[PDB]
Amino acid sequence: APMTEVEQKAAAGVFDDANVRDRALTDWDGMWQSVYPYLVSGELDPVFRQKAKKDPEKTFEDIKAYYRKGYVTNVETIGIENGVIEFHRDNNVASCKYNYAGYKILTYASGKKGVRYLFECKDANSKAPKYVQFSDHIIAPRKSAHFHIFMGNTSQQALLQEMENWPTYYPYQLKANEVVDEMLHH
Amino acid sequence: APMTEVEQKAAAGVFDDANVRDRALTDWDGMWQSVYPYLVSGELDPVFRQKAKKDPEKTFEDIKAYYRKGYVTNVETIGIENGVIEFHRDNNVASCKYNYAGYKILTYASGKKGVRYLFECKDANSKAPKYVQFSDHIIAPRKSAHFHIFMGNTSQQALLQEMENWPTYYPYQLKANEVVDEMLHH
Numbered sequence: 270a271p272m273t274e275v276e277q278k279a280a281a282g283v284f285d286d287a288n289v290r291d292r293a294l295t296d297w298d299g300m301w302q303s304v305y306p307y308l309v310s311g312e313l314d315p316v317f318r319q320k321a322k323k324d325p326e327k328t329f330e331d332i333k334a335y336y337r338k339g340y341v342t343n344v345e346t347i348g349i350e351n352g353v354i355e356f357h358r359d360n361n362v363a364s365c366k367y368n369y370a371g372y373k374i375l376t377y378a379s380g381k382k383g384v385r386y387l388f389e390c391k392d393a394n395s396k397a398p399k400y401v402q403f404s405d406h407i408i409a410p411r412k413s414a415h416f417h418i419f420m421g422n423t424s425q426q427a428l429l430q431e432m433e434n435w436p437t438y439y440p441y442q443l444k445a446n447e448v449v450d451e452m453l454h455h
Numbered sequence: 456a457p458m459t460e461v462e463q464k465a466a467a468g469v470f471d472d473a474n475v476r477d478r479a480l481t482d483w484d485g486m487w488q489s490v491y492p493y494l495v496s497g498e499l500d501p502v503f504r505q506k507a508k509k510d511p512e513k514t515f516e517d518i519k520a521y522y523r524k525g526y527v528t529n530v531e532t533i534g535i536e537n538g539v540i541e542f543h544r545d546n547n548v549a550s551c552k553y554n555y556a557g558y559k560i561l562t563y564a565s566g567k568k569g570v571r572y573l574f575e576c577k578d579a580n581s582k583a584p585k586y587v588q589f590s591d592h593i594i595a596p597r598k599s600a601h602f603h604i605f606m607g608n609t610s611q612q613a614l615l616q617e618m619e620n621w622p623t624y625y626p627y628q629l630k631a632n633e634v635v636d637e638m639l640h641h
């Protein structure tokens with residue numbers, strides 16, 4: 270099902286807090302690929318060129334740099350199924366069963382808002398991040414099309430303060446051109 | 456009289472063409488100062504810092520550079536009264552009686568729109584620019600609060616293509632802090 274007007278506005282960072290709801294980890298079920306490799310190859314260049322073309326105060330160089338810092342990660346693949354998140358970091362792999370920890374509504378310096386969905390790995394000897402936060406422009410149950418994930422081992426509160434790095438994941442099957450297509454429209 | 460909702464939207468580059476009307480040169484009557492000197496002194500820095508703070512894809516450096524190219528001019532003062540525009544360019548002065556040449560509605564790369572109000576100096580031995588275009592976020596008769604002015608000697612059509620340089624003028628009496636105040640709010 271395509272987006273209602275309330276969902277479209279919420280995706281653009283405009284929503285009433287009263288509409289925000291809990292979501293289950295299953296919203297992010299599936300196999301996913303980091304888009305960072307496509308920034309590196311130059312394959313996301315059309316996205317940044319359109320962003321630049323549309324705002325004369327911006328430059329390609331600066332927009333790319335912002336997304337470089339945003340996307341950068343060595344976790345190339347993430348798999349989510351049956352309450353478990355699996356992380357593929359170069360040749361290291363880790364997984365853990367995550368417990369839901371609620372959501373947090375944020376207001377950004379821009380005046381736009383977003384909701385993060387918080388999860389915790391409750392192991393001692395897990396190599397997987399203790400704290401994970403999903404942010405995907407959705408404020409109520411809906412299967413994700415792509416997500417940013419904040420990963421940390423210190424606390425949720427501390428992770429909530431991270432604003433510059435947000436490794437970003439699209440469905441594993443997509444090629445670079447389909448990722449670009451979605452970024453330019455969806 | 457403060458702005459109606461239609462005027463506020465039009466100032467943000469959103470309007471129906473059916474609402475656009477001719478304006479008389481008297482809308483720009485008064486004495487005016489270039490804001491370029493205030494960019495140079497650093498006194499516009501708070502404006503660019505707010506612009507940067509509000510959009511993480513932008514930088515201060517790039518925003519300032521864009522406005523540097525926009526504001527740059529040696530025409531420090533302009534006076535308008537009785538159908539005549541007077542230009543003070545360092546120690547040179549020129550003036551001419553301008554005839555109204557209509558308006559042109561433009562759509563920018565950003566999808567925002569604006570209206571330019573066209574005037575011509577019809578002399579041979581005038582040192583004043585032959586073609587002048589006012590652009591001030593107003594689409595119908597209203598006394599200007601500040602304006603961009605495109606100045607050229609080649610043709611109106613050619614001047615219509617200028618997008619990067621737009622020397623910008625606020626009422627002559629204002630100090631730097633009042634200019635900043637207006638830029639941050641009005």
Ligand code: NA
Nearest residue numbers: 285286287288
């Ligand atoms: Na509310």
Ligand code: NA
Nearest residue numbers: 294367368369
């Ligand atoms: Na769970």
Ligand code: NA
Nearest residue numbers: 471472473474
């Ligand atoms: Na119309």
Ligand code: NA
Nearest residue numbers: 480553554555
């Ligand atoms: Na006139």
Ligand SMILES: [Zn+2]
Nearest residue numbers: 405406416417
């Ligand atoms: Zn996104």
Ligand SMILES: [Zn+2]
Nearest residue numbers: 591592602603
């Ligand atoms: Zn202006």
